[PDB]
Amino acid sequence: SDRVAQLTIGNSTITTQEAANIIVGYGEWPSYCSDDDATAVDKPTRPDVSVNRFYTLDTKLWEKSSKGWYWKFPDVLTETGVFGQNAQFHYLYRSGFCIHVQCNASKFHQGALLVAILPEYVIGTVAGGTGTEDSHPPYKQTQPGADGFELQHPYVLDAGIPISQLTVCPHQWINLRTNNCATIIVPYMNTLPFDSALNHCNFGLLVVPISPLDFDQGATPVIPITITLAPMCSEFAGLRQAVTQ
């Protein structure tokens, strides 16, 4: 009664028989915005079930040489579903998330993925190699939406910070000999009650292989990793027309 679990939100239900408990980001469940914390004077929309549900957005293939991937969050879920819509029509957005990364293999396979939540995950460039050029990461890299982006220098999280310390962040590992999925529940985290789901990304989801995937030849070599996230306590205010970016 700790390795098996079921997550049910909206009209979606995730099952898992090898999970390793659930992490609750910074030990705080997602809440709605207080009356004294808010400033936007208009009564917000709380679609509830139409947006607070499990969107299974992407699948990556883990290979004996994969570097790792990340997904910026507020964004990843735009354009997809009713959530996407409310995020485009409204200026202000607010919401916590239930992230469930899954990836299974056999008892004869081995490997270990680090799954973390890095708030305000600002990306940096290699500065033209030498460090004299003041380059900047492109829209395609800082806000990749679904499909995420692949890391080029995971050791420093493409941002000059050691991944060795990335665990001071809500994390969970996917050790194949132990489990087959991670489950983080992040609350809304920003220095503001609401912000634009479009141009600001509250945090990134990191999935990095720290202990390389490996298996004797002959065992199914296609080992996918699938991301499934679900917004929680979604609130929207500041209604205008629909906006893409």
Binding site: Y26, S31, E120, P137
Partner: protein, 296 residues
Amino acid sequence: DRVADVIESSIGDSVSRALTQALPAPTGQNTQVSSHRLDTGEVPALQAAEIGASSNTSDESMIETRCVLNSHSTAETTLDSFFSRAGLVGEIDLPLEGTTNPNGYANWDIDITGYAQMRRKVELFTYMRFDAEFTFVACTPTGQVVPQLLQYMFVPPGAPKPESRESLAWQTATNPSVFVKLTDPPAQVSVPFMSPASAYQWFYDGYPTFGEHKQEKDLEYGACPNNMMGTFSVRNVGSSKSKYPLVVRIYMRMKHVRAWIPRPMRNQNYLFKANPNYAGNSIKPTGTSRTAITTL
């Protein structure tokens, strides 16, 4: 009269669940006596890192321990304790001959990410709220003290930024200025937490413009206006050439600090202000290196 799912609908709970509470930690935890334990079923030493929680194994269950009354304090590891230490954050030149800042005045964009020591410390956390004490040490490039009168003026974003030593903005009718002789002890001032956000943000993953976001504009990624506090202007108080080359060192000391969301410590060298770029070719390891894991 209602529809039930509406009477339940916990939608609108403004209070956060928690799960964890804050306890008093004036001293380090004491060590209580331990004895041998030879039993099946209880395995403290065995953990599962996958969960994502740090091992909760106590020294007591790992070895027979004595009793120790730990009275060591934890006061020096608080935030005010750690961060409330003046440090260099800005430097300004007012040379006689040159191209940097002649004309006798300078406009320093208030950005504390220009000096590696102080920068790394704060970049430990994502958000930070606090008041600060700014001190300004001025003198000539030789460290020589000179009888010169300066004027430091804090210019909030929107106020008219001085265009010359004799600019009209130096009337400073609402901006707060400080007049000081370089012979007087360094000017020092108390600054409140002035920001439209609730905390300064060292890292802002996103843009502020809201437009197209082409190549030429990637300059703005990571630029959060809630930290642009305006500029700090200084000028020798006069109509003519200063007569002496000056330098002003700006030291900031935080106080009444609140920090949130700790993140990994800067691993590589810093290259630019408000931009975590790193040397692609010179990516050095976090620490030292040996010749083999089996030798020291």
